[PDB]
Paper text:
To assemble Pol I ICs, we used a double-stranded DNA scaffold containing the Saccharomyces cerevisae core rDNA promoter from bp −50 to +20 (with +1 denoting the TSS) to prepare the Pol I CC, and a similar transcription scaffold with the same sequence but containing a 15-nucleotide (nt) mismatch (bp −10 to +5) to prepare an artificially induced Pol I OC. The Pol I-Rrn3 complex is recruited to the promoter already bound by CF to form the Pol I CC1 where CF is in a distal position (compared to Pol I ITC). At this stage, the DML/expander and A12.2C are present in the active site, which stabilize the Pol I open cleft conformation and allows Pol I to accommodate dsDNA through interactions with the clamp coiled-coil. In Pol I CC1 (a), the CF is bound to upstream DNA in a distal position from Pol I-Rrn3. At this stage, the B-finger of Rrn7 and the acidic loop of Rrn3 are not yet resolved, the cleft is open and the DNA-mimicking loop (red) is present in the active site. CC1 and CC2 differ in the position of CF and upstream DNA with respect to Pol I-Rrn3 with CC1 being rotated out by ~15° compared to CC2. CF and upstream DNA bound by CF pivot around the TSS region, which is held in the same place relative to Pol I-Rrn3 in CC1 and CC2. We therefore cannot exclude that CC1 and CC2 are rather two snapshots of a continuous movement of the CF-upstream DNA module with respect to Pol I than two distinct CC1 and CC2 states.
Transcription of pre-ribosomal RNA initiates by binding of RNA polymerase I (Pol I) to Rrn3, which stabilizes its monomeric form. Here, we present cryo-electron microscopy (cryo-EM) reconstructions of several Pol I ICs, including two CCs, two spontaneously formed OC intermediates and two OCs varying between 2.7 to 3.7 Å resolution. Together, the different reconstructions provide mechanistic insights into complex assembly, allow following template and non-template DNA strand paths, show the necessary conformational changes during promoter opening and reveal the interplay between Rrn3 and A49 tWH in promoter escape.
Residue numbers in the entry:
A (entry chain R): 1 to 38, 121 to 324, 345 to 385, 397 to 443
B (entry chain B): 117 to 688
C (entry chain S): 16 to 68, 170 to 215, 219 to 306, 316 to 335, 343 to 515, 531 to 555, 569 to 649, 656 to 779
D (entry chain Q): 86 to 388, 405 to 453, 469 to 514
E (entry chain L): 26 to 70
Write the structure that this text describes.
Amino acid sequence: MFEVPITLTNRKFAQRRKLKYQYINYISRRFDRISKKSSDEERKFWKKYEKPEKSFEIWRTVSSQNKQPINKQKMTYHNFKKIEKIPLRKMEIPLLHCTKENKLYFQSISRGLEPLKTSTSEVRNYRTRHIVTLTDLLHLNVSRHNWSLAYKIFATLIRIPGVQIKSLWGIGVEILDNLSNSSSGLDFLQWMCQIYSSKSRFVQNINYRSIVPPFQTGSRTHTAKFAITYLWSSLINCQKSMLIDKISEWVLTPPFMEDAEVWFIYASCHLLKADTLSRQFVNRDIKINQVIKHIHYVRTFLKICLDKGGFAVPSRLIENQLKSFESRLY
Amino acid sequence: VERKVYPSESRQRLTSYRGKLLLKLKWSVNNGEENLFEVRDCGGLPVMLQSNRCHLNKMSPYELVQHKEESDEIGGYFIVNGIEKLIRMLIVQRRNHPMAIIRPSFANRGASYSHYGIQIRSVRPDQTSQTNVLHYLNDGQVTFRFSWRKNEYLVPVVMILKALCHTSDREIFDGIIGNDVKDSFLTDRLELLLRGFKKRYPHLQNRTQVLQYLGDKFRVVFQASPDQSDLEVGQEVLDRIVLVHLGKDGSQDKFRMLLFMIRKLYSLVAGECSPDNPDATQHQEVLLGGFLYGMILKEKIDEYLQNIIAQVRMDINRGMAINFKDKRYMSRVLMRVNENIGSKMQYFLSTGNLVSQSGLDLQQVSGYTVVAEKINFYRFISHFRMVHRGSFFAQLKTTTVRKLLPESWGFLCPVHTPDGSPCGLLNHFAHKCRISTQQSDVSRIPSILYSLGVAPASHTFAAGPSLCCVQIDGKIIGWVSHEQGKIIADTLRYWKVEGKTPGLPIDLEIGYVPPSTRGQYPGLYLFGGHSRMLRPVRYLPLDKEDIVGPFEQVYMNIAVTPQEIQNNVHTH
Amino acid sequence: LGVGVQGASLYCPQENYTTKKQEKPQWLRPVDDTLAEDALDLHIVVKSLLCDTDAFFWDPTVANRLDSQYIQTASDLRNYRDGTEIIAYASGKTGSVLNLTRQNTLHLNRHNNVTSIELHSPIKSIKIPGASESIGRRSNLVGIITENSFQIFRIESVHSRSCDVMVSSSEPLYFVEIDDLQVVDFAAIIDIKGNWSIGRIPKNFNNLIDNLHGTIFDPEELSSWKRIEWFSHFQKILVFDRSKMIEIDFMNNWQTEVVQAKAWSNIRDYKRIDDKNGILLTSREIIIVGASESNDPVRRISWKHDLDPDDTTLRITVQKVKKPDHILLVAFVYSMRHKRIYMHVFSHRKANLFQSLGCSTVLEIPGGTPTGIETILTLDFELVVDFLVKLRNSSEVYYYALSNTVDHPEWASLFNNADEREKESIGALVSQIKLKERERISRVQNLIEHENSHDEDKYLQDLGYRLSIATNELLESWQKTKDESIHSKLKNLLENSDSFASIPEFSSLLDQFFQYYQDQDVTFIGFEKLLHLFLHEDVPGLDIFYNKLLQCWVLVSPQAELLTKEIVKDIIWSLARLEKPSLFEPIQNEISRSLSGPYQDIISSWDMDD
Amino acid sequence: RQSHKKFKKLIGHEAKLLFLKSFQFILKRQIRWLITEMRFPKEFEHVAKIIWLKILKTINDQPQEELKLQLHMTSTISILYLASTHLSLPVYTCDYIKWICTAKMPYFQASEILPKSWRIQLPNYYVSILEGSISPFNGQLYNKIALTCGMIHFKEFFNSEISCQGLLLKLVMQCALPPEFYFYTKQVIEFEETDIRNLTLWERTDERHTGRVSNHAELRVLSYFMLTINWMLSFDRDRQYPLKWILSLTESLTQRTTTSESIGRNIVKVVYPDKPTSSDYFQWSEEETLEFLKWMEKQFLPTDQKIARRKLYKIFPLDREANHDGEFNDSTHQLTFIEDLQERYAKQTPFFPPARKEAIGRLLTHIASQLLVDFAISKEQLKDCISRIKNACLHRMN
Amino acid sequence: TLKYICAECSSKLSLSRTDAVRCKDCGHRILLKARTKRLVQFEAR
DNA sequence: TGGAGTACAAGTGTGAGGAAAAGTAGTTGGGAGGTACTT
DNA sequence: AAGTACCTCCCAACTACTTTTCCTCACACTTGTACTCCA
């Protein structure tokens, strides 16, 4: 039922989804000469858009320069029955050497009738068949508040050859919520960003199967979601350590200047460092030239994200916390 | 994947302990209306052990055994293909202080050129060296001198003095004429310097017009771009060459120092100022390893910009792609240009050759780095403590550059130097000679001198050896009497070693020069900058530990044992 | 106001973390990590009842076929009858005709004067929009969708003494443009295949599409999925599909492409929550709670969540709960393929800084997949809530309430036929079995009498006698003709072999006969270790092989013994394979295949390498 | 450079013997195990070679050019099936269609660990026949049986002995009934047959069609329990099975237990999605699942950039990180197969019509679809199984 | 048996031909040779 | 009782598709850099 | 020879549509062999 980590190709289903997207390739070149006047056959469709690289969808904020007036030419029976007369006269030539349901699959989707038949649930391979049932069971007691068992489903899941990148890292909360004799959970995202430490450019043009980019690859202009999660995993775990002067040195090495938030979490590694140390046990020259640094760090680490892209902060009382840290010393 | 390499591993492999050089570029175009940011790779350059950038930095001796080094690891050197090498320190002239050299090796340059002159070495705040020699002529016409790439240029001084701030010629004149009209050696030598220029350049009246001519003849040897007018070339000459202690926003203050490098010079050709000896450990400083290494790394990314442009100059030979908002055409360029700064920097650390298509301000191009041998532990520690006087001075067999000199007291060891050919050129530092690396803060000190009896520079209109010119780092700011700065050299010392303001550092040297009959030029000279030689002494009133340079120590009476402290003489 | 955002969107997917920090060190947890602490929460259904009533595909244009929402009539404005709860549900042969008071349970009205109003063009939409929350009164009319036209009702003049609800209807205009209209919502406002419109709905009950409009048609929206709302009451509409958002002010000229989502999402609902600022989206694997901007209220993209499952039929309903410090939001995604729900707990605040708490799941009736579910908004940390149900292949409208603290049609029409021609035929066959069940009920009883007795001591050596002679016939049956190269019957006695009652002897007499052939030409097999597949467990001896068959049917057998006794002895003569020859009959057959099978066929018959 | 490289998809005839070489060595692995745990004797192994020695001749009688040897993974099931119905074993194909969904004998993924030397010289178009491609569905095990007893005379030369006293007796113990049902079905099988006793198996030599007469010997025995399950409590004046007994008759049997046969029954529901309530895995308990997750510990014995995943092994240990349930825990605390019988008989302790015929019809929903999962057929192929049993008995008594 | 030493993780792994010059318990490159029982003789001077 | 008309016993005939690993191959990340061109 | 011409020197992201050709059956044509209103 859940979104599965299986890389499996099928003969009859990879035809019929080519036979799906090539049906777009004749209903969109008719509409080129409807909205204007009035050798692989999939790659033309993907170059018609821009791949997101941020989330599941590519977005734009609204009250912007993205504006255009609405078409008022109504679309009716005299223009809709003619957008699909030219494909079915010519896209019926693969329909006579395909399988007997690649006719069935294709006629139904022009007329509503979304499939009850999802592909990887009857596949009965006995090895990608064991994966499907275990994934519903994986989320089951997680959504029922019982962590002794769903923690122990996962180790059996990651010894089956065929599992993929999605289920690896996002539900590592089962170590986060063991806590009695735990593995501490932080050394997990160390290794997960170790061997997957690619700085490859976002390839943007492959025919995307078996994965989705915006959670699990290390492409540029927005870094890995298995990378910035490690910082937020460790930093509140650094606040629970009461290693601040050992953790701001781990932003010191990577040159992730392809993003904005990774400097704001670095705009608090030296903020909270100046929380305990800006008391100094006074109630006396030694930490005065240490506190007075550890705010000016934050003064151009909060600014350095204001130099970067999208990160909207309430800049009135964030500064008022920072100004008041040096009023502690007076 | 990207794993953590340790310098134990780079010794086994016999490879160089390199760190990859990130270098992002700003390919902007069309009055900067399109802007491209390309963090591009430039090869690995070797990195110093126990630097910031080596992994051994904040590392326990217990953990140095965990990663297989000696428990008392020295560091501070390079591993160049297994051979442990380091950049030798060299002795160069003190920054930002106009020396008063006499030199018979000026008479080679032509007839009527004298033997005297003023030499300054203004460093830039990014450690770049630049010498502005100021000669003297029998004719009276003082000729400024500098070097831009590999050549030697001569200009009349008033052409600069007209160009620095917007002066009339009497504003130039009475600028020099502070007092001492009645001296017939000021008021007559000064005439031909003004009379000749009005005769030589009658058609160059004001500063906007003198920059029309100065950026004209120095246009194409500076390789400036055709969008820049002749004044904007000339302003860039005035911001790249003459007195680069400030650069821009100091074109008033760069004027007030050339009024000081002439009134010194006229107080030399009469002989009221005895000439400074550059060997004497008081006008010479230390050129460190990294500060040299941070100049050649600036030079090699100046030879990288000019090669990208040379590639586009190889694209004007085609009509191939005139496409400068194009993304891929920039990649078409830089996948062809030699962007390997890897073995361009390591080649400096292998052979010792200081290759430069531009050219530094130093005079030799070899022997900059050696082999840190390991034949015992005494030999290996003394590489880091050695300093070489300079590779040119092996020519001069006059032993003045080789002799033990009294200003080496506490800075250079009188004993520890080898015998044989470099016996004297290869003398080491002392047990406590600690060197300033960062500079200090000077945003507080001028507010303290004006709080004392110092009149400011602009309001005053005075000069001469008979007053005391107060300077900080080659920035003339004041004028007082000789008994005034005689107290300020005690007053600033109390205000320093006690806890008054964090703006006053303790590495600051207070070089008060007392006035003397035909001796060194009197003045009160402060330096706080990079690359000085400092050692700890014990200051007797308010008894604290004090820091004293080799320029203060020429005029102090520092006792040795407290059995031998006399009265009214020893402050330290 | 929130600190960790981007502006394109605002992230918190399932169970990983959040990305923000307010940093308020005032002794009260100086961090606002969204995964907040609470006690455990589990939802318990309350079973009740409310009322009564191609093969590999399922259509998107069918959305709703039942409704019950607090909508008020026209006549209760001067009277203080504060809001009504009326019923409307589809009925008929294929569901075309259309026809309460929350006392303790949710049930049909008490004097059942429902009007089964006749509709000759069938039902695919039973839905009201309601009104806005800050206008002063409720709406009083509902427009639905028929397969031929577009009808308009009116909720006027309901009473109390008769519990009667009538409507006054406007005549529907048919499809002048013959395209299937998708969803109606008011907020003759329509969504036909191709285009949209706005209409001034009339004000009489006895007796217009405005003169500016536009289209919505897309070629590469492969489904016919559409759904429409309005945005924030100021002349702005929202037209959706599986693909994008169409925001039109029909007075201005401004089209907006915010949700560019033909890439990896499939929008399966769009729902306007009653607070007009926070509007929810529940498309493909996404759960967006995108709010409104205060500068220009056109859209804010706010706190969103992923949806982990991979279902394509997810509807949604969202019920607010107004508690004195936070504002609750849920999400019911129910399937016409399966039973699972997947929900959230949100807490909307005033300064637009709102978090989530966790996810939780409930299931349904096993027989049927839920096809229609609506909340009960109730006149507007003990997480109690309630909702109605309706399922596919289940036309029985139950009631359930989530508090905090089935035979198939392939069976019934076949078995127990109405044949009078053969009524007593099987009817005698239930007395044919007892004619031999009780023929064989007393022969065992005489064996209950004789237990190791003397006239079956007659039998037991005769059982040795007639099972010792007729073995060498079948051991000299194939000695003359052993060269076969081209069996074990053991039914040689013919008395009954069923008139002797001893468990420890007849096993140990056949096993006594096995050792009698310690010579060749016969191979015997065992029973203590071969015969275990009934018991699913070890058999050390045959006394306790039978005893687990004897300690299992004590009461349910007729007096525990007589049917149990001839179970195992039957299996003894059903496992009567004891007369295969010795090894020299298979092995010389194995060499005729190894040698007439040529030099390719040696290694073809080859075990023994690992 | 070609001297180092071999095994390159090019083997002409020896590769056609590779599946004739590999598929007896894996056969050697399968029945040697059946003596070890499934307790079948020395006469279970000696039988199963000549069965394989005349299945080579089944291909060798066809000509060598364009031979297209028709075999499957169910071939080693079907030559094991001949070591069952000739050997007079009480076994039924429930005990082979389910114990491969527990995968006790090495049937699934017989390429991965079983040969250890005969993988690399395989062309990749017989690779879908040597390993665990799919599971046999909708009677696919019952269709290779037509290839088995059919071309060579398994009748005449040997005996087709579904021990018909057993599947009746097996279904007695499968669902906790009074043992009068063991003899109730006796005069039902013996009334729809010509030459009444000792049914035989369907063979095939000419056709390509599944049996619409449904002449499989075991499949007919499966239908024979399906009307006598309806008779004794609705066609009954005797009313011996009482009226309070009906409530704990169906729903007690439709209640999840945790025996070693009922946990292993659940994976048939996992592998086969087709039948309803095959997705009933959501309603497990803790020790019902740790047995399933230690059922994985017999799944995983068949089923330089590798030391990185060693750290994934290291940070996720299969055993618990502190005090698992192995050493200092229960010796004998598992509920057995002689318990869920006897507990329900302790539950159905009472012993001494429209509200009855509907309340017996609940039992028709359970056990006539409990038959469906224990053999993995479809309910529309249950309808081919029914429609030749009742009308012919309607045709034979008249 | 001829084996070698991983310099990094200190794990004695042998080396056949047509193999990577690597470690296999860690992923290290530089790898050093161990000694076995072999007769060497010395004067005690 | 002899003769039909629709329900139906009973033999053999057509093509046409799911298995999924198996290794090769679809554009731009990639991989480096002095040798190779007659205007 | 005089500084271009700029052609490439050149591997290969995750699989891209091929891909090795093997193998399970589907889905109804045939006219009695059955059970029957007019004749």
